[PDB]
């Protein structure tokens, strides 16, 4: 199926507490592969997935030097933005940046991204087709004019459409054993007496990869939403994901309800029903 | 504003330690140091892409750097050796935008075993030839700085208390008085050409000043001649009716 | 690995001529290309800055472009002037290597000779304003096709030629100086 590579950067000012904090994480699909934290002792970009450790010293030296340059630019931006907004010298603020690319099933470029946020709100971002900028306010307009004089959009697209897609493919191949693995969900259904006239049915989907999945309830063959609860997809902690959907039903009528599970790892969607 | 390097000139004794400073107020993430021997190319010593980060270039041996703030990038010579006599340059830039490199003015260091070889220049101004004046209606004054070591001088012309550049040409480089001698003293000439009418006016005052960079305030000096410290040596001439 | 080559290495021309200096590089993945000027005993002055997204720039009589064949740049100097004399250095920065280190070429040393319209070669003797005893010999007003050899006798010193420009009267001229602390030394037998 589709694939993506993405880098997430977070910088937080810490008034009277040293340099701001800088954290960088890298992901391929739903798998983190690299890390950098300005407070850790190593001061190295570090591996977080097995396949990336096959890269040599030049790679790690280069990625470390690039992520450090990145931390230095964000440390400056924190001061610039405070200036644009005429803000607190001793107040804590946050700058986030995300960039990367999406490729289809055949591994060909689909789209790219480069977005920036200040204090959890959109600041400036490249539009969907990468050919122009979206600037939130007068401050972002100041950034936008500087970025257009330096031809930043063009610099990024060269990376987002070429280099980014080239490394995503390199990683997917080297880490094929885990990155191109499809782990169908292990499923089951639980049953609890809620009260004198009700019973709860909980449909589970466990140990699945990638995270994209669909859990739904039907009653008498028709979609059911009344008295239902669907939790956010969550990480198991071992590289896999979990998710569940529940429904409250009248006691004695639980077999009229069915749970449908759709995931890329299943050659055919599964249908669960309460079997006492 | 821009890149500021200090000191611009320096004389060291073999074995002394020395720190050259470099500051910029442009919020440049990148700072670096180079050395360039006379007539040779620029060689990278060390560089930094961020505070707390430094890396080596082509020639990091004998040097140390630190980047504790974004503005400063000091270069430390651990133990001066004659082979470290060179011209040092700090250069900075954004690691984005245009990536344009910004160079400091340069720092000229000379490392010496014996500071007794440091001499200031003797300066003299030679007046226009009457034959020149009678043939061309122009008058050329020659300034000559001799016997200085090291080759750390800045020559300038001052007419009526104001520095002039029109009508002037100074040798691009001094000449070693004794080429085969190491620590040979130098000589440098300059010319200031004016119209005969301007030279013939006795109110006109022509001064050649040579700023020499030598021993610092704390260097030892017990020789018979005056301590060869950083100083200005000049010679002058006044126009003349006849 | 990146290698910057600059041709020609040396260039000697009469003033008024339009010049073309070349800077070629082996690794086309660059972030920028920058031209500088450096004169003997002085620092580096940045002249122009071009990138793959902003392939040309102009600064007076100078203009540089990042050519179509992604491994070369040309610096054009229109109506050359003696003031243009200097070593022209070109440097490029990396787009992908993760080091950010620039790569410089060996440079192009340019000498632009002034047009001496009315040559009046002559050697004059100048005396010290402080004491007539000392003297200097001045060879001046010779054309730009004359060479001055810093040669002979270890006690006789001769400087290289240099051009001065009297801007108010749009007049330039060449000259060299010679001196010696000895007897027998006359300015007549001082040059060549």
């Amino acid at each position: 199926g589709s694939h993506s590579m993405r880098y997430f950067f977070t910088s937080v000012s810490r008034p009277g507490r040293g340099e701001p904090r800088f954290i960088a994480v890298g992901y391929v699909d739903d798998t983190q592969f690299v890390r950098f934290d300005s407070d850790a002792a190593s001061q190295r970009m570090e591996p977080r997935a097995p396949w990336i450790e096959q890269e040599g010293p030049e790679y790690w030296d280069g990625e470390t030097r690039k992520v450090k340059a990145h931390s230095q630019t964000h440390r400056v931006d924190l001061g610039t933005l405070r200036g644009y907004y005429n803000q607190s010298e001793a107040g804590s603020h946050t700058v986030q940046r995300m960039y990367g690319c999406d490729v289809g099933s055949d591994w060909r470029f689909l789209r790219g991204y480069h977005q920036y946020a200040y204090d959890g709100k959109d600041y400036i971002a490249l539009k969907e087709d990468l050919r122009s900028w979206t600037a939130a306010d007068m401050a972002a307009q100041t950034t936008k004019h500087k970025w257009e004089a330096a031809h930043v959009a063009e610099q990024l697209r060269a990376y987002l459409e070429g280099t980014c897609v080239e490394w995503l493919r390199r990683y997917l191949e080297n880490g094929k054993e885990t990155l191109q693995r499809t782990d169908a969900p292990k499923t089951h259904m639980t049953h609890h007496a809620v009260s004198d006239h009700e019973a709860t049915l909980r449909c589970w989907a466990l140990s699945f990869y990638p995270a994209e999945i669909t859990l739904t309830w039907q009653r008498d063959g028709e979609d059911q939403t009344q008295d239902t609860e669907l939790v956010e997809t969550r990480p198991a902690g071992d590289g896999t994901f979990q998710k569940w959907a529940a429904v409250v039903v009248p006691s004695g009528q639980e077999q009229r309800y069915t749970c449908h599970v759709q995931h890329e790892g299943l050659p055919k969607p599964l249908t669960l029903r309460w079997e006492p | 504003m821009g890149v500021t390097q200090t000191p611009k000139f320096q004389v060291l004794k073999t074995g002394q330690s020395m720190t050259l400073q470099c500051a910029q107020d442009m919020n440049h993430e990148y700072m670096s140091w180079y050395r360039q021997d006379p007539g040779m190319g620029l060689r990278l010593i060390h560089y930094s892409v961020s505070v707390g980060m430094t890396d080596q270039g082509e020639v990091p041996n004998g040097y140390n750097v630190s980047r504790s703030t974004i503005e400063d990038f000091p270069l430390r010579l651990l133990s001066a050796a004659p082979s470290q006599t060179s011209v040092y340059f700090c250069a900075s830039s954004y690691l984005g935008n245009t990536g344009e490199l910004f160079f400091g003015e340069g720092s000229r260091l000379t490392v010496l075993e014996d500071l007794k070889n440091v001499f200031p220049p003797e300066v003299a101004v030679f007046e226009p030839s009457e034959a020149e004046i009678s043939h061309t209606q122009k008058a050329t004054l020659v300034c000559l700085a001799t016997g200085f070591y090291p080759d750390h001088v800045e020559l300038s012309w001052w007419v009526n208390g104001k520095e002039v550049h029109s009508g002037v040409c100074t040798d691009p480089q001094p000449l070693k008085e004794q080429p085969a001698l190491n620590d040979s003293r130098y000589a440098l000439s300059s010319r200031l050409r004016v119209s005969a009418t301007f030279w013939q006016d006795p109110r006109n005052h022509f001064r050649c000043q040579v700023q020499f960079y030598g021993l610092s305030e704390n260097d030892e000096w017990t020789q018979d001649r005056a301590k060869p410290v950083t100083q200005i040596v000049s010679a002058e001439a006044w126009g003349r009716a006849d | 690995k990146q290698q910057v080559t600059q041709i020609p290495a040396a260039l000697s021309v009469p003033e008024g001529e339009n010049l073309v200096l070349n800077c070629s590089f082996t690794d086309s993945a660059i972030y920028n290309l920058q031209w500088f000027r450096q004169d003997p005993g002085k620092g580096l002055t940045s002249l122009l800055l071009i990138t793959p997204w902003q392939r040309e720039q102009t600064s007076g009589r100078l203009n540089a472009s990042l050519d179509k064949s992604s491994g070369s740049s040309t610096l054009y100097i229109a109506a050359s002037q003696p003031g243009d004399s200097a070593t022209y250095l070109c440097a490029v920065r990396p787009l992908l290597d993760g080091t950010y280190i620039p790569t410089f070429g060996r440079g192009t040393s340019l000498i632009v000779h002034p047009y001496i319209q009315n040559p009046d070669p002559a050697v004059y003797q100048l005396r010290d304003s402080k004491s007539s005893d000392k003297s200097v010999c001045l060879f001046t007003d010779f054309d730009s096709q004359t060479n001055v050899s810093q040669s002979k006798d270890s006690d006789v010193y001769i400087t290289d030629k240099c051009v001065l420009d009297m801007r108010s009267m749009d007049f330039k001229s060449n000259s060299a100086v010679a001196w010696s602390n000895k007897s027998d030394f006359a300015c007549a037998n001082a040059f060549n």
């Binding site: 880098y7 890298g26 690039k66 630019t73 610099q155 990376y159 | 919020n27 | -």
Partner: peptide, 9 residues
Amino acid sequence: SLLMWITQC
């Protein structure tokens, strides 16, 4: 692999 050059806001 990370982007190498980042321009300040």
